[model samples]
Target chain A: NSVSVDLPGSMKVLVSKSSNADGKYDLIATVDALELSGTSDKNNGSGVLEGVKADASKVKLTISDDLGQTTLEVFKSDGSTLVSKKVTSGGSSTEEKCTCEKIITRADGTRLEYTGIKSDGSGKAKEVLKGYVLEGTLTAEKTTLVVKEGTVTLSKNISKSGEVSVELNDTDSSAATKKTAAWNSGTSTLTITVNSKKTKDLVFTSSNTITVQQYDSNGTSLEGSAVEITKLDEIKNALK
Target chain B: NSVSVDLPGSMKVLVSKSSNADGKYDLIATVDALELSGTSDKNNGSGVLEGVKADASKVKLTISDDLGQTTLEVFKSDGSTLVSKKVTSGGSSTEEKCTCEKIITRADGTRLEYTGIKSDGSGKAKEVLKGYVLEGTLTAEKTTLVVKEGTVTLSKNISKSGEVSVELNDTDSSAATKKTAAWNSGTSTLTITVNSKKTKDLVFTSSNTITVQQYDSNGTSLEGSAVEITKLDEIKNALK
Candidate 1:
């Protein structure tokens, strides 16, 4: 099945004044809203914030550029380390690079990976990773057919520069057991190919392909296949 | 409003057969599911897992008796750690003891406190804690209205006994800017009183009462007020 979603190109911000000891409060700042009508094809979007505390000299800004990239930046009243990050539609390559720091997401249904160390509050850094290599089968029905299978492995490690490399491997069909899957990125579709030994009594042959659309929750593609049954079933099964 | 949810008394487990070198697979084991139709008022629950790889002959079992108590025992397919902790629903004094390990949750909508430390993954134990002194406000609509202000001062320290304490403090009602909240626990309601200077031009007055139904996702009136608004809006605001 095929699906489509319209991503928003802009977002909205609400500004309200904080009350002070002197009983002084005011609507300090307001960033106008935008109309995201033409960028659905680019899968761009924005969001909103309410009751945000703003000092007389400070303000937060969210900017979306033509490259379908939206940047959320918080500036100190006196100009400090600008807390800035870019946000892209989910499941996109750019989504991973939006922050200067690591933001981990599911590597697949079976596992999760962290790309680097996060601050541990006391000026120390630590690897922010969790979960186990799960093994299970997930069943999904679409058009008179159901699929069930276990997931492959997702691995991670730290480099000298503090960057982390997260990898999703494929099940080398030739291997007899302890099999997994491999994924190929597409322009709009995420394709997961599982290679397993015929010995396993599960659905699909040694080689099976599941393709699904990649979109975001901008409400544009309200019911699109941002969730593909084939690939997702594998991940969900692994999680179970 | 007193809201209740029926937490599933039990969940389902599946058993699968492993594939052999010759491409043969079959179901080796199976377990039945349980129905929890009468335990909602007590807010108690349990879960089990099978086929969980232990040694060659062992498996893992995690039993949560109630909100603050959970026992994770890895047996020889049998010899138990006998390790058990009392589980109290969130916000309840008992909810804090669900494990020997510290389970942190929001004390109010604006603050989160950790009364203990968890087994920090490594064979070596450590405290899992982080975050900063966040200043925020929360709003709720009940009969009249409720708002609270608090300065969330997050804290933690390394310990050998595997216990940790994380706390958030208020600046006292007299302090104009930096403020915090205090919570009062009840049988079915969580009450948070915001202490702030009347001077601030924001959500809460010097003393505002934010009361919410204390219940668990299981529809159990577990001592938890998952509705703490201060800790919530920051998370909500951060997400946007």
Candidate 2:
């Protein structure tokens, strides 16, 4: 059974925990992981038990004690909840999938997916995540001056978890590679920005030839249908 | 005494031997001596002699042995006489300072009186002539948001021979420069051209800096006026 807790304008996930000793308990939260480190602990609340050490990856969060709190909550500065876990002891089992994210690709059927698409020290394109198998081209050609907006569908199943992004290269000469498969996901809106110019030229290329076969966060990349790239000149004109 | 010739339109001064002799004549023109160069050998029908030569730098015209047929004369391409000088045998005499032409100053102070201003190799900007100069900064500051029309004033005396061009660099933080000074001299209307931008930060700086030690073609700078630097905010308000 799936339980949805609607808190004003937020979606709250429910988690239940068992206590070593059955009794009324006060709720407390302790952050155990973060993507970035060195975050000050000044904002964390005082726990009834000893402070829990942050996880090695900071992604795995821990509670001070099992069944010690009711609705363990996590909130951003703007009151948005990052994640909330009900105080639970042992025997916690859950299923999660890696989100399919977009990655950069070249006209040559190559792609690079990672959280950050940046240049390496040697002035080369590289991704932080290794074994990322990017499958499309970044650059495409102008098949139709106009394109039709299509339903952007994504089929995602995460066997792993990691961040994924995409880069693309597009030009007229390489029209063959300008298909929807060149992208990681199918999104209705397609935009290309060049150096503050409405440019129509060779576009961004894939980051290196390396493929990141790693898993990442949810809503990032999909398995069966990752890129929902579909647009024809006729479609774009129709949108207008 | 001295004789001066005023041309109604642009003329190409030339020297030719007169077909007829015995014409008492003296000729001088208001053209730059440096721009004048020629020699005449003419013999009139009476077997009389003629000889004439011009020293352009000194603005001097000389006539010597009035050999029968030699009568120095200036004529249009259609053969209309503009100026004629005749001297009997050895009847030649030289005159000085018979011509005076206006001097034009270039705005670029570094490259002497004429040579300066170029392109960055990205596009097409280059030197047009040897004696090219920018006279002064044409201040077009009146292009404020509140005003409807703005004025563009040239800073220095641009080469009168070449067309004046104007370019704007709104993308850069400082400003963009132009290789040519666009001066609509015939109309004498100082107008502002709006790029495809309704709101933008653009400052028009003189690409060529001209130094006016004595005189400038465009005219002296208006007091302490440099290039017309207008803030984007200021120009927006000047419009209606």
Candidate 3:
């Protein structure tokens, strides 16, 4: 029930971007709206897509330093509501839904993102999409979205990995009713399904308490604190 | 759901006071009037608590010609509705307010009036009101008030078991307007809560497919079925 992220310190490559692992990296942004003042049990805070896949513009940030001016504020994990503050560059960026698809390496070895494991085809072969973290960097690493049995046989021929594949399909083959809710670690269940039956029952409430601020690339705000998925109804519900 | 039962296949040894053990005996009988009839689809049904809980005056019952004058029914285990009915007195009995408990015994030595274990006390963990085959010799048994979790121990004699001084805590419980859905055939998930916030939001709709028949105690017809829970906008503005 608490979160605070003031940006104003600075250091490394805080947040970067470079795509074409093959050819699909549609990066858009604009969440510049979220400001719920809390206290009333936290106050109606809301944001879906936990484990990974709300792709806010291929978000891959990393920055460290003992200097000053490193800011990065991505609230909405329940810091009492402030989805995107001090995020600059036209805010709004979601669509990083990952059930698998990760292969990075570029501090010199060259190659960053040939990712390809879209679990939107939920044939359910042990659904995996662990944390997928990179919060401001310093040892938060817990990113995994592998897929060795349900299908994923890419041999090593990287092309482009900037991102973009909005076709979407995994949840029971996409019955589509607001999904993408398995992140704060793994299986938390946020299934909503009200396509029609006169639609009855679907209300999720949260008052903010998720905060991850560790920035650099000139956005400044680092020094510890970055771990989310605090069980807000474990992910919401509705499939009975 | 559906359920039916109408006794007189005798193997009697009445007791809620006498005290004896033959072989397989687990019963709980509570008969109110004995006019057992069936035919339901959505009135709601799911009662299975086999007979024999004697001593409400031990109304005479002793017959065993390979067991005949029978009538026991219960549906909705997917059959869909016909919730209750009873009559176990081939000797004379009446108690009202839904008095139908049964739990007999006869797997090897056959003859048990009571052995223990039957707690809906909420904290779970004491189930064994064994067979008469579903509210046994049927008088009608279907009860489902969900959102379970109960346990209260402090036994010394009537065989209450032992070891739990206190560990039953779900404290803040809730259930708005019309709430009562007790169908626990081993946890199926029926949660409904609203312990006051003006109390409301509990409208269900699930009917069509439960018809039963198993006449005997003279009143005839024995079988019936049908069903379906939740919260929603103060139960739709408390049904307006």
Candidate 4:
């Protein structure tokens, strides 16, 4: 069995204790060692609680004497509970897979939309941009996983615009090394079709050679330039 | 009396002498000490000749001795005369104020057409782009005279584009020092209108301060920035 709790909007939790008229203590309360702290926005905040265990071997409750009030309350600022629920603990639990979406607007009028799925403390997501798409994974250690492939469509009619696709893979042949790859092996191809000529394009290969070809208005090959990255440091600097 | 020679295309001058069979200086020939050495293109070249004085006191001609056949000829490489002419000595020369035009094509496919009036030894010209105009005078010292006033129109619809006007004067009010002024008292105003809102522009003053204002999509003013040149060296460096 699984157990969970859902809160209405955002709420604050308070714990208080009182004593009886008799000198001896008659009542004690424990809520399975629950802990709550901090505050957050209702729609744009997220945090994780650690040390929540499923060890419930202690006695539930058996009070023989009545005592003064000792209680815990969770409520909003205006004292309203639109949707609040308390779930009791059970036996075995099933793993939870959550999915969410978020949108971020930049100062330059550009927007980024992210849709992701999180399971077992790791997540895979897709970031969408105007005429561009990026897909990557996040590991449990919070390190950036290698981007296997991505594609981008250009927004201009110049030589750098149009359909551009990139693919990445691990340089090492062994499967074990491939699992922990970064931005090592990357190659891309760009196809630009302006007017009706498809002669202007770029082809980048794994050998670090990038070839660029452009055409004139008369469909004549203007000129071509070659760029080769012979060292790994150059690749790192380029990415930076 | 005044005399001048005008060549239709371009020409070269040669001076030599010959002797009779007796090997004696039969007849000494001489023309008003003239020296021409610079080569210029017939269509795309220009130059100015100065310090040429008029001295007409010698006899016209009297070759009575048996002098050798000494002559001066001007022709093209194919021995053809393409509008080349030699003007004889005349009286009452006219001060020439020649004007011409040339077109320059830049690598970015933009053209700059220059029209100028050439008098004594210096000239004044105007370079016109699509919406930009730069009018300056050329001096005998090969320095561009400070453009007293000019106007420019933008090529793009973004920040710096639109009808822009500028005024330039001498930094010093003294009339003696104003004769050789460079980029001293330069001031300009720029107006950029986008989406029917006149919001973005630049203001530069003779005090060496520049103010830039930008606007958002909704026509709201963005943060403004200022650039000041307190040191004269800063202004010199900027021009350089």
lDDT of each: 0.27, 0.26, 0.23, 0.31
Candidate 2, residues A1-240, lDDT tens digits: the string is 222222211212222232224432232323333221211122221123222233211122333333222223333333342332333322222221111122333323333332211111011122212223212212122111111233322111111222233333334243332322223334322232323322111111133222112112232332232222122232222222
Model 1 agreement with the true structure over A13-84: per-residue lDDT tens digits? 222223345543221213343222111112222233222333423333332334343443344445453332
lDDT of 2 at B212: 17
The residue ranges of model 4 lying beyond 4 angstroms of the native Cα positions read A1-240, B1-85, B89-101, B107-110, B115-124, B138-146, B149-171, B174-240
Question: What DockQ does candidate 1 score?
Answer: 0.01
Over A42-70, each residue of candidate 4 has an lDDT whose tens digit, in order, gives 21212212122243121212111121111
Candidate 3 C-alpha lDDT tens digits along B11-77: 2222222223442222334434322222222111212233322221213222222333223433333
Candidates in descending TM-score order:
4, 1, 2, 3
lDDT of 1: 0.27
Highest TM-score: which candidate? 4
TM-score, B chain, candidate 2? 0.21
Categorize the docking of model 3: incorrect
Candidate number of the best lDDT: 4
Lowest-scoring 10 consecutive residues by lDDT in candidate 4 chain A?
A62-71
Superposed Cα deviation of residue B130, candidate 1 (Å): 19
What are the per-residue Cα lDDT tens digits for candidate 4 across B83-112? 121222121111111233334443233333
DockQ per candidate: 0.01, 0.01, 0.00, 0.00
Each candidate structure's TM-score, on Cα atoms with residue i matched to residue i, is 0.16, 0.15, 0.12, 0.19
Worst 10 residues of 1 chain A by lDDT: A93-102
Give the CAPRI rating of model 2.
Answer: incorrect
**Model 2 spans with C-alpha error above 4 angstroms:** A1-110, A115-152, A157-240, B1-228, B231-240
